[PDB]
Nucleic acid binder design. Structure first.
Lengths: 72, 73, 50, 246, 105, 90
RNA sequence: GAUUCACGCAGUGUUAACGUGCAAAUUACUUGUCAUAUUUGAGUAUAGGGGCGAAAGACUCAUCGAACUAUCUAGUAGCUGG
RNA sequence: AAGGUUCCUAAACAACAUUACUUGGAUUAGGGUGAAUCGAUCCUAAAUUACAGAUGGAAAUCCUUAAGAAAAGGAUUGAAAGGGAAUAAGAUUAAUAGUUCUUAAUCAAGAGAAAUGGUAACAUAUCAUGAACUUUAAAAUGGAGUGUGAAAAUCUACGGAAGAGUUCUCUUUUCUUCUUAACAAAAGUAAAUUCCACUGAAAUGAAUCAAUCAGAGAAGUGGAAUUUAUUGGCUUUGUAAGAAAUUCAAUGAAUUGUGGUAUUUUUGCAGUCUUCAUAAAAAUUAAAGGGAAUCUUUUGCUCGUACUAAUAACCGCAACAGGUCUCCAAGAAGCAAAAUCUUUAGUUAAAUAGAAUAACGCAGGUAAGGGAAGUCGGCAACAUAGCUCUGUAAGUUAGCAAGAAAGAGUAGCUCUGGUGAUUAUCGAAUCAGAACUUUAAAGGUUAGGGGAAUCCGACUGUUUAAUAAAAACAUAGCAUUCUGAUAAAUCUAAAAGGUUCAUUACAGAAUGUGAUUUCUGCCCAGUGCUCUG
RNA sequence: UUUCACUCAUUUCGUUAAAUGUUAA
């Protein structure tokens, strides 16, 4: 009963949306975000996760207040 | 909804200035004087037709009176 | 659920807003390749993971 | 191999004390002038059952000697105390059952309980149900007295250590034979998570040093040194003797 | 045999979720939220339930009449009539006994 | 109704004759009334292990686990009194 | 921590059905059990030479005699195929 | 909880729902979720996280009131099942309703020398002043089983009103409706418990199903208080008949008694039993001790509210025979919430049908004579089966074995007697007995095969999710070892660090054997362990 | 170096850091 039958009781969320990265990676019991490294001030980045670095970093967003500064 | 039990208070209640509306209902055997004041709806049940008229002489002329009978208004 | 937070319902409502197709007049622009919205999902077809 | 169950106990994750319905800390009131050069009177309001321990606890209510109001303590019931009783604590208290006196005032052969191992620590020795300690001698030169611990060992304490006269209630608790596994299950309702003990020889070599092969046995001596590292220390430690005694 | 439904969103038969089924017009049965059973006051000495004070929730005593939540007696409302009689004797007899024992007896 | 298994007859036949005989002494003494040391009425009944309450007397007494007064708790009360009397006089 | 029936639960047997199945472990009858060492929801705690285990090397997201995932890493191959 | 627009309507059927579809939980486009009273918000539980401090090479770890010039006293979070101020009936929408409409209330925050009565228990439309400080109580506390009060549902007696069914054979017949909220009032009147006054019990009484109680005071008489799903439990009353239900007519008219010594459910109450188990806290409220001081009207903010909750809206790749926490609950029959049939409600479609009626299959069966001769093995099937009376062995831990084994009875119709309440009537199913009859009667469904031995485990219990449920594990019992607590075990790199420990030898920690009975023999050379040498 | 006596770092505790020590009385 480790296969089809045991999946019926999965109705309790483990992760919900995070406030700093917007992904469903905020662990409710651990009170930390697995993706963006919440309340820890420094953003969570690792050298082994090089693809994780090119998905969310500088230049992947609107760059609202830095596009003018470098253009200036 | 409260109920008054005799004449000495309903005449006192009507002669006070807290009245808002009076509905008189003619049931099969009795008549109920549901005086609607600010807070409650006091009623008095009478089995004598003559005693009911004396109440109607005491109703102030600056208030609304509604007649209810075997047919709803 | 019947009970939800205020922020969660607004993000629920936006998912309803984005489940629409290309308007007909947009498809008639010159040099148009956008005919369908490939970001479309249905409640019984794909769960939006939120 | 894995970590033996003894190693997992020091972590304290599921082996924590189940102390939720416990009444509090059972100890003498803090030592002050009125408990050192006078007497305070306490009224035994009630006797209650503290989960996880075999002796009843008494709610004693002393009046505040310095301010206005009450001062509620939680003593351990000496056998014989009753509700509404008056108990006196101090260096000049009467030598009745339930009174608290320094260990240096009790005569030789006096039976005391809830003895302080150091003046002012509010109760260390002779606290289990039915247990007590006896006064052996006094030494007025250094103001120290000798008492016999319930294990039979002898200890030397300062004469200022307070103690409660009598024996602890709930005696004979362990004389009743447990009959059912259910009764043993309910014993640890307010204790640690240690009851159902699997024999080490019934496990596998990874889990325990006794995890045997084709026949359930130990294979090596079960008397070990005290200096054995955790994980391999099992059975008897620094055992000077074994077997049955004639 | 009219079968009813929970009116509120609670779906479990907890103590705070007590319901009573009453009748209404046309044979209709509705659901009434019934209150919990509360204990009364006890004498601070003997732990006996006092007489003359109702057994209602703590906030409901505020709505009660000021004379309907206590008994007109010394230590009334916190001690039984027996709890107080022994207090008077203790306060008097002990005072009299020591009035002749010390101070140039 | 029984011959010799008086109160331990509820255990049936599944705990050993000796173990049922040993617990018979405790089970009889645990559920029995004792004379109240204040009102002298046979009303003291156990509430918890070591706590006894006099039903018609309004008193609670600390005692043994299954008996109101134990043997070790009786020689101690007499020993203290003898030392107390000797200490007071010379 | 007595004997049984019922709502439920399990999984003794048929080593029945099915075995490119209803189902990556299910179905039918039979059997056992069906409240105190009981059944169960939610919250919470314990994390990889670690945890948890009435102890089967069992369980730890269909993964366990050491999980999953990414980097070292295009690990090395006297061996196999081209 | 999870899903997230799947809810409603209209148009439309290219694709999808193993045929087809005018159908759709599918396409297109609009519409839909209304709160002072329901919840979140508030409080704390297990637990969780900050400033300063301690530790660390480091990231970071520890501490949660101890270390602090920090917080009258102890910081943050933590429950839509724990605690909690206050809303009900009717109607309305294609869809929302304790949320809208009508009617009727409730709650909170505002605004406009200081009382009597009763012997007493105690009582008075706010009444009848009560500060600092202190205490008490409430919120707030297990389970079992027995008795009983009340309401509802079902059943039934009496008196009708209205409508419907049956009617060639009868049937004064069968069936349906005859109702009432929150909040308050007080004509009439209950059950149980605890107290108060008089008096003083033995020839001891009083009492329950059981108990249990009394000269620190019974029974008796007279009172007081509390509980009984809002005021005050039930009938009754205002609400309130104007509503609603059943009929009649073409919006308008008719009625809406009283009971029961029956069953079930719910809900309280009263004592009894049980534990080496004693079965939460805070927010918030009231009262006391004390004596400091001298009716009207206004407002009630933020968020959730649609729908499924499952043999089609959730998790399993799906419209998957798997899995997923709860509330309300009719009749027959029976011990039974059992199997079987029906009523209110729902549905007739839920991976396509038609023809023929071959072999081999899957599911359910029967059988002449024999009766395990089949087979590794009575595997599979057959057989016993409810209730009543008689009767029951060896063995035994004296409790059991035991429903041992074995034998007899059971139907229908017509009768008779027993078990009560009130002074002849009223009512309950239960037991026993007697004639007569037949197809000779538990068996439509439900429903134990029995006996004589041997081995292992003492027993109840747990176990390899998905080939092993067992003699394996656990268990109580027995026994051994260490430890005086600054200890023993033991987690951590470290730490005024952490667990047993809110502890203290009747304790903590580490082991072997496995109930009870009986007995545990000899050996200290070797290897461990230890020594006061 | 050993053997003693003290506290002054240090170890372990307790509190509302709530009468410790010495005199007068």
């Amino acid at each position: 009963t480790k296969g089809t039958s045991c999946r019926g009781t999965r109705h309790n969320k483990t992760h919900i949306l995070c406030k700093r990265c917007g992904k469903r990676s905020w662990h409710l019991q651990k009170q930390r975000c697995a993706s963006c490294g919440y309340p820890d001030a420094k953003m969570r980045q690792y050298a082994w996760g090089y693809k994780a670095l090119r998905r969310r970093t500088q230049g992947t967003g609107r760059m609202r207040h830095l596009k003018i500064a470098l253009k200036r | 909804p409260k109920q008054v039990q005799e004449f000495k208070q309903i005449l006192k209640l009507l002669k006070s200035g807290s009245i808002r509306a009076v509905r008189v209902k003619t049931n099969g055997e009795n008549t109920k004087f549901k005086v609607r004041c600010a807070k409650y709806l006091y009623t008095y049940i009478c089995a004598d037709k003559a005693k009911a008229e004396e109440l109607k002489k005491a109703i102030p002329k600056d208030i609304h009176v509604v007649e209810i009978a075997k047919k709803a208004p | 659920t019947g009970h939800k937070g205020f922020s969660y319902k607004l993000k629920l409502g936006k998912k309803i807003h984005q489940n629409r197709g290309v308007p007909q007049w947009f498809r008639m622009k010159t040099g148009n390749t956008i005919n369908y919205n490939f970001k479309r999902r249905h409640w019984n077809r794909r769960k939006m993971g939120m | 191999g894995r970590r033996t169950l003894s190693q997992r106990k020091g972590r304290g994750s599921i082996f924590k004390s189940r102390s939720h319905h416990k009444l509090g800390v059972a100890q003498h009131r803090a030592i002050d002038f009125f408990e050192r050069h006078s007497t305070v009177r306490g009224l035994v309001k009630s006797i209650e059952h503290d989960p996880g321990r075999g002796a009843p606890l008494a709610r004693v209510v002393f009046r505040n000697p310095r301010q206005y109001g009450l001062d509620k303590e939680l003593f351990i019931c000496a056998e014989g105390l009753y509700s509404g009783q008056y108990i006196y604590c101090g260096s000049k208290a009467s030598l009745h059952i339930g009174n608290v006196l320094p260990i240096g005032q009790c005569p030789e052969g006096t039976v005391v309980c809830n003895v302080e191992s150091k003046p002012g620590d509010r109760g260390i020795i002779a606290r289990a149900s039915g247990n007590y300690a006896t006064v052996i001698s006094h030494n007025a030169d250094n103001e120290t007295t000798r008492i016999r611990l319930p294990s039979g060992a002898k200890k030397t304490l300062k004469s200022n250590c307070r103690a409660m006269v009598g024996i602890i209630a709930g005696g004979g608790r362990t004389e009743k034979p447990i009959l059912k596994a259910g009764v043993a299950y309910r014993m640890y309702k307010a204790k640690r998570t240690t009851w159902p003990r699997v024999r080490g020889v019934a496990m596998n070599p990874v889990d325990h040093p006794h995890g045997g092969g084709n026949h359930q046995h130990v294979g090596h001596p079960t008397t070990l040194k005290r200096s054995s590292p955790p994980g391999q220390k099992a059975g008897k430690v620094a055992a000077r003797r074994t077997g049955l005694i004639r | 045999a009219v079968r009813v439904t929970y009116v509120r969103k609670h779906s479990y038969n907890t103590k705070s979720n007590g319901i009573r089924i009453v009748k209404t017009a046309g044979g209709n049965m509705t659901v009434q939220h019934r209150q919990k059973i509360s204990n009364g006051v006890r004498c601070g000495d003997c732990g006996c339930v006092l007489a003359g004070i109702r057994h209602i929730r703590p906030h409901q005593y505020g709505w009660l009449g000021k004379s309907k939540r206590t008994v007109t007696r010394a230590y009334g409302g916190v001690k039984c009539h027996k709890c107080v009689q022994k207090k008077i004797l203790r306060a008097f007899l002990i005072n009299e006994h020591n009035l002749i024992k010390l101070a140039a007896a | 109704r029984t011959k010799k298994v008086g109160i331990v007859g509820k255990y049936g036949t599944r705990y050993g004759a000796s173990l049922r005989k040993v617990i018979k002494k405790i089970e009889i003494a645990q559920h029995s009334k004792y004379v109240c040391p204040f009102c002298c009425k046979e009303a003291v009944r156990r509430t918890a292990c070591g706590i006894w309450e006099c039903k018609g007397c309004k008193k609670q007494i600390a005692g043994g686990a299954y008996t109101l007064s134990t043997i070790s708790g009786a020689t101690v009360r007499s020993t203290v009194r003898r030392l107390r009397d000797a200490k007071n006089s010379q």
